[PDB]
């Protein structure tokens, strides 16, 4: 019998809120990274942007205050922690990555706070640009591949 | 700390 | 004068130990559930994970032996027994809950042994995922809200 | 598409299995009963579908060499009437040239139970020897 | 369209027959393993013997010939393949097992040919001794529990 | 290949239980009929009562309910089916019999349900009185003679 304590805390004062999300039960549904349909072996880098579940556009984070707040954005490694989509039925995997800039250069490194700025009376967009490498080796099995990345807007 | 989910999808078929 | 007996017992043989805790005086400090800063009325579900007081990551329970032991995890209802954080100065309360899975579905029911597995030469993590409902009604007073959940790793 | 496991390619024809009733006397009072044994593994034919979503495939068995489900003696002209059922209680019969429905699910191989059954012959003793038949099982979509 | 062949065979020459069975439609009804009535929690091992459907006594297998034939007996795992009786209405299960000897020691292992001997002009009995463990934990729901073991007399 | 069915059944509702037994593996050990030591040729009828393996006294059958249930008791013919004890080493036999009443009159006939009554909140004893005829003819060989009678409490 090892009984222990867990201090719970919350500082209600002046915070920042994330728009574009829908409450899926008790977990914020931020959006979808839909690469679309594809064949077994694709030569072109498959690339799609996150579509917020609430509006359809990009996640719009706004802060509540008058001074420009600096908030951070961190995305995790997905269900299996290595950014791989898994086929619903078979065990095939599809490696992918999420970048922050339009040219697929600034990568959202696993469990890292990619910095962001936000001014009063404005909503800043969180571009989560997906990208998949060209698979010109083995044709992955037919079906639907999925993953649930947890995006962590933290301060 | 606002943690949220982003469903990733890909339909490998044709 | 009602004098009575209390039998004390301890079976020293082959037990299981919880890592990630720090001994706060004579009580094991397991960690912190830090939701962060927030405004009076938040529309997004505030959500944070427990951070072990010893390492900063998740509580890592390991057992001492060779066969996989099945240990249980039970969390209580907090200081007031209804999972509410209380403002340090005023009497305002903030209802919350702790879940076990990443999607805020498998709730750690009050005083219930949520089952867990553990194999030899490995440490299993105890995910205590916090979650707070969207308060879009009354703005709670400014200040710091706290609670001390007692996590009970028992066999 | 969907594929059938448990078969061995006999030349250019898929050998699915054997319905071995075993040895018996001229006149048997008990219903002789045996299950199909796949030629590849020895167990039941395991059909799996190459897909993610569930697929509904059908199974049809024909009437044998002579089209009336009769085993024939290799040498003489004696016949032994039989039937193949789908369920363990010999009730759901695989009707001649009929698609008995079947389901198959994500990442799994479904078994095709072909349960044989022979009526009690308590009338005339069939001649000694080996009785055979080749049922053509038709897994179609 | 995957069309395949199934070779059917039967060697009519000199075989062995099982007595004590009744033809239920096109399936041989060998008998009944009736443990009788019982309460929710029984402390004594419930134990009963198979009663042939044709005579009421034990299944009497006789062979047709002059030399002593060695025939085998195999019993399967029941409807659900784990030797559990199921309540007709609810989903409660009652684990049991069938043994070959009177002292509940020689178990009829699942899908195994327990050997047997048989001489000319004699019928050998097939003792299928049932046995149920003492349930002194949870009281199973009221009603009738059933199972249909398929006994496989093979050569 | 003669495959057949064996229907298994159990009616969990309101049953009767037998006390005084110990579970020997998966078979209920009811007791011992110890006639004691004796010489090759005894002139007096050797006579002893069953001693329950659990308590040492008589088997105490109790029923679980409020109305007086009428349960039956049946004893079989022993290992060889003719109530004979066999020497562990040699083939000598010692004929015996089990009676129900104290005067060795009401015999527990082979495979017969000798009736019995039982009321609520009470345990009824099952007197299994052994008796051996006076052997004043041939002296049986030295050693230990044994038998295992199967007592069948059925409803």
> Across the strands, what pairs with E98?
E130
Asked if residues F95 and F82 have their Cβ atoms less than 8 Å apart, the reply is yes
F3 interfaces chain E, CB cutoff of 8 Å? yes
**β-bridge mates for residue F69, sequence order:** F118
Kindly determine whether residue E28 and residue D24, on different chains, have CB atoms separated by under 8 Å: no
| Contact between F2 and D89 using a beta-carbon 8 Å cutoff | no
Local structure of residue A81 (DSSP, 8 states): S
Beta bridge partners of E11: D23, D130
* Tokens, residue A55: 């509006």
Q: Decide if B1 and C47 are in contact by the 8 Å CB cutoff.
A: yes
**Secondary structure of residue A29 in the 3-state scheme:** strand
Nearest Cα residue to B9 out of A79, A58, A133, A34: A34
Any E CB within 8 A of F67 CB? no
Alpha carbon separation from F96 to F129, F130, F155 (Å, rounded) = 11, 7, 27
Residue E14 touches partner D, C-beta closer than 8 Å: yes
What are the tokens at A145?
């591949």
D&E contacts, CB < 8 Å? 152
CB contact under 8 A, E155 and F10: no
C-beta atoms of F8 and E130 within 8 A: yes
Q: Mind giving me the DSSP string for D13-64? A: EEEEEEEEEEEE-SS--SPB--BEEETTTSS-EEEEESSSS-EEEEEEE---
Chain D residues touching E16 at Cβ < 8 A: 23
Q: Does the beta carbon of D33 lie under 8 angstroms from any beta carbon of chain F?
A: yes
Taking alpha carbons only, the member of A10, A83, A152, A6 closest to residue C77 is: A6
Q: Which of E1, E3, E5, E12 to mutate to test the interface with D (most CBs of D within 10 A)?
A: E12
How far apart are alpha carbons A70 and E125 in whole angstroms? 86
Q: What is the DSSP string of C100-132?
A: SSTTS-SB--TT--EEEEE-TT-EEEE--EEEB
Strands B2-12 vs A27-38: parallel, antiparallel or unpaired: parallel
- Does residue A32 belong to the interface with chain B, where contact is any CB pair within 8 Å? yes
Task: Say if the Cβ atoms of F27 and E44 lie within 8 Å.
Answer: no
| Three-state secondary-structure class, residue A116 | strand
Whether D50 sits inside 8 A of A141 (CB atoms) is yes
**Residue E63 burial (CB count, 10 A):** 25
Half-sphere exposure of residue A130, counting CA atoms within 13 Å on the CB side?
Answer: 30
Burial of A128 (0-12, 13-18, 19+ CB in 10 A): buried
User: What stretch of H or E contains A140?
Assistant: none
Is-contact C117 C65, C-beta < 8 A? no
Annotated resolution, angstroms: 7.6
Cβ–Cβ < 8 Å for A65, A56:
no
C44 and chain B: CB distance < 8 Å anywhere? Answer: yes
């Amino acid at each position: 019998a090892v009984t222990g304590q867990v201090d719970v805390k919350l500082n209600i004062s002046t915070g920042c809120t994330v728009g574009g999300s829908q409450t899926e039960g008790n977990m914020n549904k931020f959006g979808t990274l839909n690469f679309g349909k594809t064949s077994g072996t694709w030569n072109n880098v498959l690339t799609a942007e996150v579509a917020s579940a609430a509006t359809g556009g990009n996640i719009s984070v706004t802060c509540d205050g008058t001074d420009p707040v600096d908030f951070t954005v961190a995305i995790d490694g997905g269900e299996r922690t290595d950014r791989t989509l898994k086929n619903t039925a078979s065990a095939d995997v599809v490696a992918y990555n999420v970048y922050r800039d339009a040219a697929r250069t600034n990568l959202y490194v696993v469990n890292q706070p990619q910095q962001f700025t936000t001014v009063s009376g404005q909503a800043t967009a969180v571009p989560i640009f997906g990208a998949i490498a060209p698979n010109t080796g083995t044709p992955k099995a037919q079906g639907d591949y999925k993953d649930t990345l947890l995006v962590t807007v933290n301060f």
